[PDB]
Each structure stands twice: as C-alpha cells, then as structure tokens.
C-alpha cells in the first residue's frame, strides 16, 4: 500500500491532474519494486498505452524474477492488443512462458478474451472463464482488487452475449461499485447500455449517456458511446445525432446506412451495403450486414443470412433481430426458437 | 453494428 496510497492521494487531492502525477511517479519507480509491478496494473488497467509500454520495457530487462514475469506477459497482451499478432500466436506465447506467479496464471487466462469480445468471436470464453479462481491471488492487494473489476466487466459481456440480460447487469453493477477506474466504469455502462437495447429504449439511453458523460475527454471511449447510440437510435427509429459520416470503419458506415434505409432512401443504402459485402470485417459484423440487407429487400435469404452469422458468431442477444424479421414472414415459431435458444 | 468493450 505504497502505490495504493499514492493513487489514492492523488485521485481525491488532485483529481483533475491525475494522469500528469501518475506518470511521474510510475515512470521514476525501480522495475524491481512491488510498486512498479503494481503500477503496470495502473496503466493498463486505465488503457494509457504508451505509459504501459513504457513500463513493459523498463520491467522486461529486470532482476526480479517476478518483475521479469509481468513484464513478458503484458509484452505478449500488448502486442496482441495493438494486433501484431492474433490470438493463436497469443495462446501458443503463454503456453511456451512457464507461469510461476499465481497472478500472470490469473491474467494470462483473460489475455486473449479480450481479443475474442473484440472479434466477435463469443464461442471461447465461456469455458475459459471457468477455470480461473480469484483466491490463487493472495499476494498483492491492488493487482487482485482490479482483476476483480476486470473479470466482474468480461463476465458482465459473456453473460450478454448468451443472452442472460438480468446477469450481465448484476456483473456491470458488481464493476461499478468496485471500482474508480474510468475504463471499467466505461465499460460497465456500455454493457448496461447494451443489454437494454430491446428491453427499454429509455434506460439503454440511460445507461449510455451516463458512461457518454464519464468517457468524454478520451476520444477512443467516446466512440463505443456514439457507436451505440447511433445503433440505439437507427434501431428505433428516432432522430440520430450520433453518426459519423466520414468514417470508413465497417460499424460506422453500417450506421449510416442503417439510417437511410430509416429514412425511406433503399436505392442509395442498397449501393452502399454492396459496397461493404467484400470489405475485411468479423463474423459479427456480417451479422449485422444481411441483417441490414434484409430491411432492403425484405428477401428472406437475407434473414436467413444474417442468422446464420449470428450463429457462427454464438451472439444471443443480436440473433433476435432477424428471427422477429422472419417470424412476421409467418416462419414456424418453434423452429426460429430452437435457434434463439 | 454494436461494439462491447471490457
């Protein structure tokens, strides 16, 4: 708690200068001291990527042992990132390392689930979430307190995408109440936002201008705000002030377009939805992409399509979209449930 | 498209 008590300092007493403070002090400290590993934790858990990446290489080329460890591992965890490297050469890196610490066991297991929740890739975690135990860590109190919010955050999205809404609230809720960092409460209120999506248009917007408000300032927690209120607005068909028309990135232009077929314009949104089908994107994302075609054309195919994603996807939650557009085509009820389940 | 991030 030499750390601790200096974040804990500066957080109340300075609180709107903390990360000029923070990167001082992290900076000056020894690799070899509990506190420099405790501060690796700081810069990562709070997405300040150069200062992690600064600490990775002080700490890399270290005499303690375990400074040694920590630095290898968030090595591989930034690399994988920044997306260097993908999620089999991750999984093979941790593998070959020899795990002595019962922490870099813990952190090592959640490593490529972050990459899968950003791939779209939801099949993974579930299983390998069940193996990780939060009492193997018993050593270092605030390395174990924000590896509590970080699990608490990714089952909070497992729980999502299997579609056990009143879960990943429960674990979103848990994040809030155990943490101050920003990206977890980012985090948390995103899942919350998301979870409400179909439920209640009035506290999925809650919930996602309350992290809006936390995010702004950080101009990469902004956009999964505006990204999903532009979906939130282009679903139920409201004004939408949340668009960016001058991205070319798979989810933002799927919002525009997603907004013209909105507003009545089905030959420009057809163009452009062309134009997207063989661009690079994620399973998931193509979920979403016949999804939209399916509005178009009103081809069941599309619908078909689009589940058919989902499914490869193992997303819960979005498979719902186009099983309701297939049920008002007069599609068997039970068949489209044995799909939703 | 919808984002989550953790």
Same mark, same amino acid.
């Given at each position: 708690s030499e750390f601790n008590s200096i974040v804990n300092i500066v957080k109340t007493?300075?609180? %709107?200068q903390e990360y000029e403070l923070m990167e001082n002090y992290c900076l000056l @400290?020894?690799?070899?001291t509990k506190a420099a590993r405790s501060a690796l934790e700081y810069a990562d858990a709070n997405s300040f990527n150069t200062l992690t990446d600064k600490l990775v290489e002080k700490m890399s080329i270290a005499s303690n042992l375990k400074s040694k460890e920590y630095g290898k591992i968030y090595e591989i965890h930034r690399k994988l990132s920044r997306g260097e490297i993908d999620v089999l050469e991750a999984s093979k890196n941790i593998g070959k390392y020899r795990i002595k610490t019962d922490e870099m066991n813990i952190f090592s297991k959640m490593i490529p689930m972050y990459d899968y929740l950003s791939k779209g #890739?939801? =099949?993974?975690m579930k299983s390998l979430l069940? !193996? /990780? %135990? @939060?009492? %193997? /860590? &018993?050593?270092n109190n605030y390395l174990k307190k924000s590896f509590e919010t970080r699990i608490y955050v990714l089952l909070s999205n497992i729980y999502l995408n299997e579609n056990e809404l009143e879960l990943s609230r429960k674990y979103a809720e848990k994040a809030i109440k155990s943490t101050d960092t920003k990206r977890f409460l980012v985090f948390s209120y995103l899942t919350i936002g998301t979870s409400y999506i179909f439920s209640d248009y009035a506290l999925s917007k809650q919930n996602y201008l309350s992290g809006y408000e936390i995010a702004k300032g950080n101009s990469v927690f902004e956009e999964f705000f505006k990204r999903n209120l532009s979906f939130l607005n282009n679903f139920w068909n409201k004004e939408n002030?949340? /668009? #960016?028309? %001058? =991205?070319?990135?798979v989810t933002d232009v799927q919002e525009v377009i997603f907004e013209l077929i909105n507003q009545k314009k089905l030959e420009r949104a057809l163009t452009l939805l062309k134009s997207l089908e063989? &661009? &690079? !994107?994620?399973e998931n994302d193509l979920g979403f992409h016949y999804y939209l075609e399916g509005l178009i054309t009103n081809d069941k195919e599309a619908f078909y399509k689009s589940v058919e994603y989902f499914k490869l996807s193992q997303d819960k939650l979005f498979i719902k979209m186009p099983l309701i557009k297939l049920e008002s085509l007069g599609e068997n009820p039970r068949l489209l449930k044995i799909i939703s389940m | 498209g919808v984002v989550r991030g953790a």
């Open positions: 007493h300075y609180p %709107d @400290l020894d690799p070899n #890739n939801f =099949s993974p069940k !193996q /990780i %135990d @939060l009492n %193997d /860590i &018993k050593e002030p949340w /668009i #960016n028309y %001058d =991205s070319n990135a063989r &661009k &690079k !994107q994620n | -």
